[PDB]
Amino acid sequence: SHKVTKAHNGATLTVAVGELVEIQLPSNPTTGFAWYFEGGTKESPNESMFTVENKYFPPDSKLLGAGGTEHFHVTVKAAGTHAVNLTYMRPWTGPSHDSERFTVYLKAN
Amino acid sequence: DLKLPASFDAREQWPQCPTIKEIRDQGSCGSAWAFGAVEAISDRICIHTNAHVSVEVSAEDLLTCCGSMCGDGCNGGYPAEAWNFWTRKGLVSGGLYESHVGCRPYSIPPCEAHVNGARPPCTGEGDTPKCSKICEPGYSPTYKQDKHYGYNSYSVSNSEKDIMAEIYKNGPVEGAFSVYSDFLLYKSGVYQHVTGEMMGGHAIRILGWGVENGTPYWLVANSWNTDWGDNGFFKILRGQDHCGIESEVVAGIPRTDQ
Numbered sequence: 001s002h003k004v005t006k007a008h009n010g011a012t013l014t015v016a017v018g019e020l021v022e023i024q025l026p027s028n029p030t031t032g033f034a035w036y037f038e039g040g041t042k043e044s045p046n047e048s049m050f051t052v053e054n055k056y057f058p059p060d061s062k063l064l065g066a067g068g069t070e071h072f073h074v075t076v077k078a079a080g081t082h083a084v085n086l087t088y089m090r091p092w093t094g095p096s097h098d099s100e101r102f103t104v105y106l107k108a109n
Numbered sequence: 110d111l112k113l114p115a116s117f118d119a120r121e122q123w124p125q126c127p128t129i130k131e132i133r134d135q136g137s138c139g140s141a142w143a144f145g146a147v148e149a150i151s152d153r154i155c156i157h158t159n160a161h162v163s164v165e166v167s168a169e170d171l172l173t174c175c176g177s178m179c180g181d182g183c184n185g186g187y188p189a190e191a192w193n194f195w196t197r198k199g200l201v202s203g204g205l206y207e208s209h210v211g212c213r214p215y216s217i218p219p220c221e222a223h224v225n226g227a228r229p230p231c232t233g234e235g236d237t238p239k240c241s242k243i244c245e246p247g248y249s250p251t252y253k254q255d256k257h258y259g260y261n262s263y264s265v266s267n268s269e270k271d272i273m274a275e276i277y278k279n280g281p282v283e284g285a286f287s288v289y290s291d292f293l294l295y296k297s298g299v300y301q302h303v304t305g306e307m308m309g310g311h312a313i314r315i316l317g318w319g320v321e322n323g324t325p326y327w328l329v330a331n332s333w334n335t336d337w338g339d340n341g342f343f344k345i346l347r348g349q350d351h352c353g354i355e356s357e358v359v360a361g362i363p364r365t366d367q
Contacts, residue, residue: 028139058307063181090293092294094222
């Protein structure tokens with residue numbers, strides 16, 4: 001588990017097949033936004049390449065609209081270099097070319 | 110002598126108060142706490158004056174000038190405290206992004222689908238703008254002269270009948286409820302939480318009630334633009350403090366400007 005954050009956008013991590021990689025990104029879904037894979041899902045684009053679980057961590061308080069953090073737990077399933085491409089968007093809107101993106105590449109032998 | 114109707118829609122009871130119908134967009138700022146307030150305050154000023162005064166009260170003013178009492182600007186805030194600020198310092202007018210309406214129109218761009226880039230983009234990370242006590246160029250009344258004040262502010266009890274009474278007599282209120290992920294993709298009918306993770310508390314404007322297909326509901330405006338949900342509004346189950354929708358209702362009566 002690596003604790004990959006925005007500071008690590010664009011990195012290639014060397015990982016073992018089976019290893020869990022933990023991504024944490026800032027997120028504020030009370031503004032309507034959250035992180036999705038292409039097409040507005042939190043599911044892996046390709047389960048045979050890697051699996052993903054996700055959980056959002058809200059501030060536990062009455063500070064309404066404070067941002068929290070989304071955790072994605074990615075397990076690599078096969079050898080190769082696998083792109084994890086997330087986009088920060090309102091899911092009814094779609095993304096645009098200005099949308100904030102996060103990508104990391106997971107390399108397994 | 111206290112017979113509440115089965116349904117009530119503030120837009121119909123007060124049809125010459127356009128703000129009641131108006132959906133705003135907070136953009137990528139955690140300012141719903143401020144929007145719920147200024148939206149219901151706008152509505153109540155118009156109601157209070159039988160439509161002689163119809164003004165869009167500035168989210169920007171509240172977001173930027175309230176400070177500690179209200180929380181942390183674009184990084185979240187407190188509804189009750191917003192209404193207390195209106196009673197103490199008042200709020201100027203200000204419309205939608207790039208509207209040139211009022212003293213201090215909202216300075217943060219909307220985030221509905223947009224193409225070919227004739228607008229600054231929506232970003233996860235945004236500053237709270239500064240408290241500038243000056244009106245936009247072209248807007249005539251000075252900042253101080255444009256202030257609208259509250260007579261009072263108060264909590265409404267966690268009681269369906271008390272909230273209905275409050276809306277029926279005095280106009281739309283601000284409330285708050287727990288957002289779950291299934292709420293994001295709401296399109297129509299009565300929202301009930303049935304799946305998805307907790308996403309935190311969210312402030313909104315409650316402007317009426319009714320029954321749809323046998324399901325009692327609250328009529329609620331969101332601040333995620335008109336493209337979201339049912340043209341910016343939604344209905345949410347009423348009578349069971351669903352998602353806490355009945356538990357944190359606040360309001361206040363305006364001081365007469367006319």
